[PDB]
């Protein structure tokens, strides 16, 4: 009742969330200088960290 079991599901979810917050900090630091109508939401996020 006090011990909780975790599976591949929420473990992978937490790992993906860590990757997501990392790339979110990255894209926010990059976005602090970006302007309007000069980019697409494709190269703003890098797939390599995920």
């Amino acid at each position: 009742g006090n011990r909780r079991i975790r599976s591949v599901g929420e473990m992978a979810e937490n790992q993906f969330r860590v990757g997501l917050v990392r790339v979110e900090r990255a894209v926010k630091e990059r976005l602090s200088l970006g302007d309007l109508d000069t980019l697409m939401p494709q190269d703003m996020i890098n797939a390599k960290p995920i």
Binding site: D35, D37, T38, L39, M40
Partner: protein, 210 residues
């Protein structure tokens, strides 16, 4: 700051400006990196940069805007334009661009484009929906190019004889078949002079290869 004022100015005024800005010893390097450092300093203390040139798209995806006086050569003076502009405005190789540009940070060294203003001396809205070059329908020349100036100088008679032997018009192909030692350089010079004096509305371009 505009680019052409610093491009077509003599290098002496550039040396004076770089010495007045309190910079490194400027006269010890190329004109290219001289004007590059001058623009960098003026951007560090000043407003946005205003550049212009002709666009070349490589096989890489991005584009380089190069100036006319350097015969469109690589160097620090080129302007990097991302493929995002080539996707938005649907740019093409050889597009005469002029607009706002910014200085580079780490990882970059070329001035990145901020916002285009004039594309081939035309508004981007008018240039968006246009007609391709090869899609046009060629035809024969109808408007004859008058090469006689009317003053009758000592050498303009050459052009006169030209009008006597080869009536040139808008859309004609001219092949000057001449061995060396024959005096075609001043001939082409006088032709250009006359065609700019009589028809100053049409653009005139010359190309000296080898």
């Amino acid at each position: 700051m505009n680019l052409t004022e610093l491009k077509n100015t003599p290098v002496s005024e550039l040396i004076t400006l770089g010495e007045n800005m309190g910079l490194e010893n400027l006269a010890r390097m190329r004109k290219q990196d001289i004007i590059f450092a001058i623009l960098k300093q003026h951007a560090k203390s000043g407003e946005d940069i205003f550049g212009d040139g002709v666009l070349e798209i490589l096989q890489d995806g991005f584009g380089f805007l190069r100036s006319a006086d350097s015969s469109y050569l690589a160097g620090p003076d080129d302007i990097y334009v991302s493929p995002s502009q080539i996707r938005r405005f649907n740019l093409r190789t050889g597009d005469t661009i002029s607009g706002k540009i910014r200085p580079p940070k780490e990882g970059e060294r070329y001035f990145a484009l901020l916002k285009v203003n004039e594309v081939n001396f035309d508004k981007p809205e008018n240039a968006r929906n246009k007609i391709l070059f090869e899609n046009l329908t060629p035809l024969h020349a109808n408007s004859r190019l008058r090469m006689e100036r009317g003053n009758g100088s000592t050498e303009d008679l050459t052009a006169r004889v030209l009008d006597l032997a080869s009536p040139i018009g808008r859309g004609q192909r001219g092949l000057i078949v001449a061995p060396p030692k024959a005096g075609k350089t001043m001939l082409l010079q006088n032709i250009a002079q006359s065609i700019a004096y009589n028809h100053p509305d049409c653009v005139l371009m010359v190309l000296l290869i080898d």
